[PDB]
Symmetry: C5
Subunit: 254 residues, 5 copies
């Protein structure tokens, strides 16, 4: 039950800047690789069903907990405004390939970010009838099998991104669940097309819904979840170097 | 030409909401039930595909039906459910590793695309056309414009078949939405050519579609049902047809007065 | 010229008796290799090779401006004159995805791709056009089409003296040598986009919920001074398997009202 | 360039104070043996690297088209002057399909590097002379090169970057750029494209205006009685030949304006 | 940071005595294989092959951030200062079409295409940047440039401890390993777009009639706290005939006014 927002004063508002690292899976271990660049992609036979954990990208996950607050009404932190910019280099010389000429980053892309008062809700799906995912580090939809390539009430697994072990290659954001959350995604096909990426210093995102309510930190935490798959360069998967976030909080009665 | 009166002021008792997923439909080569697949069987070669592609190498319009709670009915003024607002988002994965092809490198999804959705108080009205002078369609599962022949590749008053999407057997490769018929319906489509271009697909959590026409009237469920019809052909990957994994819908209803 | 010396007065307030609506489809036109009647085809015959195509392509390997004519009901008419005025229209193109019909014998999926031309025009008279040549040797079909110069070439540039000025009165005008005249089309609204030819795909949107207003700076639509409205259009989508494709057919919903004019 | 002039009230527009002209402007290809311009939409075949990279034949390059308009004459203390406040401009263009079929087989079209540009002014367009590379000279024939038998820098130089005004049809779009530091009493507009064989996309209509008033509601002032149109529409390459727009249309809308003597 | 601990008051109402304007050009910078002075080139030396380029490309095969500095006239005449404030600017890039200079020896028209990077920044201090590596082995030129690590590699990811934080004080910063810091650039407005590398063409617009406003949420532009304004930019257009091209040069028109500040 959402009541009036506390009029914002120096005592009622909170700001944080932070960077979020991209996540590549781990071929022999359980800690995430904070890499912008993956290990070489395996060949069809392997990649099509069981790609090495370090040839896939996972949702990065970051958690923010603003200062503690000092009845029948309760005061809660509300995210109402944010800036987010991705760190990115041009690959030119690092793009020169042994054949000769300039390959670059190109191919399939996935840009996504999410802010919420809880973990991001996702759905487990398969691209094809035989894709399993890494047999190693990642939480697959089915740990040694395949889930359908279509929505199933009974068989489509419903998970929450609580760790950095969720491959963007088999987990989609759930459009039927993500309350108290704003999320945003674009994906691209794969006839070797270039990523186009803009970045500025002068660009805000408002977060208020139809009723002027932002994201409510009901449990004291805010959940950031994101991924910026840029494509492939020299048979290696590239992501954004890292993503910046400036979060603007105020207090709200509940 | 029915008689639309005032919308009932929306209260907790007069409004209705549903969330649902719609599955993509691939045709059935050895059967009559639809395949709920995001990925098809391998495409046949020119000689076959150009005239009679296997039913499981084509995409069909998905069809879903919603019937909101009964309205306990003045033998003069009726109450009708009215769809005035909706959200729709498509579920989609990036194909990277599943995109690696045997020759080496990263193929992806690319090629011809077709995005389409429709909401209505009746089935979607369509027109039967042929891409070329010899395209028949699957000789198997689908309702073809002409069951063992070809219809013209042009609009004909006499020869262009006019059907309504009442089942999941209508191939997007020979059925187009009828711009001269779809009253009490809002529909929307984009198609792409085929020099192996990538699909670009956005999805969000914060995006609405208003459905009111010039007179502020949404879609009226005159028979108590709302008809959803859609297709999201994403292109081809490794000689196989891909669609969106599934499409989400949140429907917003209110009640509206109509005269007999 | 077309609107010259016409004196436009108040629009008649629109009532059930003063307004008129029509829906219609317009068929694409491919030229005719051994005839004079138009081929209503969305798909052409196979393209000839350079030597032929570059100068004299077979009439059935080119697209012509489709032409359709609408005449609203008679008006029971002093110094004033009621006249039909087109003020609003919807137009949508019928289009299929070519996937299986796109599979080519070499293997894989060719599609429609290459040079494109989208165009439509509404007017109270035929569309005014200018005859030009893409190159120094393009003549056009020696068969069915009205060429800028029957067995020669016209310049590849605007010439006051040598650039032919015609009006699209029939379905014999090839989009490959006739351009809309920007210096003539009064009492007419027209619209065109063309694409180059490094095999790029057509992108085509269609809806149910999209209008075009037709009123000019003075709030005057298209006036049917002779009782007829002239529709002129072409939707060249590109090439698939060495064959020219167009839109299947184009839909039109025309909205008319009455308007006062001096004699 | 504009300073010194003192702009007063615009004369309220009546049938006696306003002027309109429609006109076409022809594209210009250079002349391999001659000093008159070729009014061509299509050039002669492009030379090979060794030649083209440094000294391309004059008829393998595009030059800025130039057209001049002088409205009717006008008759004490302060002057009446013609002011361009509104214009329409549309390019004439064909689809190349059959003329696009190439001897190898299939449909080549127009594709490659593009340059769209137009300018309206009360004086010639001010340009800057630059070189794409360290060895590009330009045609040794018809064109005014930045340096008639040498190269100018591939970068702005206060001392070495030549500053000219487009007074004739001899200026190659391949070595002359509009000067962003000079063009007062002028509105100009340009887009260029790179060269991995990409197609031109070109729109044309009947129902599209360009307003020309600046921040102070002042259009282009014809201080010397003439208006200067300058333009170029490089569409790309088809069958090893350079194509431009067929011709560009212009409808110019003039009114009168007061200026202190 | 750069702003925090400053107290901004009313802008001085702009009169002929309180406002200042400058026009200037900024030259592109290619690195120097043998020297320490920058090469003001729009075109680089031929790109090295993978083995070299991937880790240690020759300084003259990379682009560096151009840097330009503007210092407006001194302000004459306690408890508060007058300061110069940039509130408006125009910026346009000088660019040629490469057609004939694009013809390549194998035949046909190559052009400029491939990876692109457009960027500009205005500030009251140097632009803050972060040192990152594209890959696990990229070092940069062993010659002219300030590398993130002068003989080694820095991470390909943000590290609080290991990601170097520098300020662009000279023309020795390679756009191939230095990114603008989104967590630092107060009293600065910056803007960038990058493109991937499947040989895609640059598309570049330029006009005469296009402004950029610079006021923030509170209507405050860029404040020249030390009397200088810092311009920093780069326009990597792509590659033509195995050579790196940039914009020829970038124009700037800067609009200043005066503003009150507490000491
Ligand atoms: Cl189910
Ligand atoms: Cl018929
Ligand atoms: Cl003449
Ligand atoms: Cl200098
Ligand atoms: Cl850290
Ligand atoms: Na941005
Ligand atoms: Na969306
Ligand atoms: Na539309
Ligand atoms: Na236009
Ligand atoms: Na601009």
């Amino acid at each position: 039950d959402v009541l009036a927002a506390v009029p914002l004063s120096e005592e009622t508002e909170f700001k944080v800047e932070l960077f979020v690292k991209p996540v590549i899976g781990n071929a022999e271990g359980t800690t995430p690789h904070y890499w912008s660049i993956s290990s070489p992609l395996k060949t069809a036979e392997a990649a099509n069903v069981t790609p090495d954990a370090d040839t896939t990208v996972c949702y990065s996950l970051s958690q923010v907990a603003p200062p503690d607050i000092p009845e029948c009404d309760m005061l809660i932190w509300e995210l109402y405004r944010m800036e987010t910019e991705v760190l990115v280099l041009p690959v030119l010389n690092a793009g020169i390939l042994t054949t000769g000429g300039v390959g670059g980053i190109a191919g399939p892309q996935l840009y996504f970010w999410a802010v919420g008062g809880q973990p991001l809700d996702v759905l487990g799906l398969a691209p094809t009838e035989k894709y399993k995912g890494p047999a190693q580090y990642t939480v697959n939809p089915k740990t040694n099998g395949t889930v359908p390539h279509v929505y199933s009430s009974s068989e489509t697994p419903k998970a929450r991104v609580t760790n950095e072990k969720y491959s963007i290659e088999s987990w989609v954001a759930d459009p039927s669940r993500n309350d108290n959350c704003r999320y945003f995604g674009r994906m691209v096909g794969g006839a070797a097309t270039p990523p186009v990426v803009s970045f500025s210093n002068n660009s805000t995102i408002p977060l208020l819904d139809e009723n002027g309510i932002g994201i409510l930190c009901l449990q004291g935490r805010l959940y950031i979840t994101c991924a910026d798959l840029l494509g492939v360069n020299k048979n290696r998967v590239h992501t954004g170097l890292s993503r910046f976030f400036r979060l603007h909080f105020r207090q709200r009665r509940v």
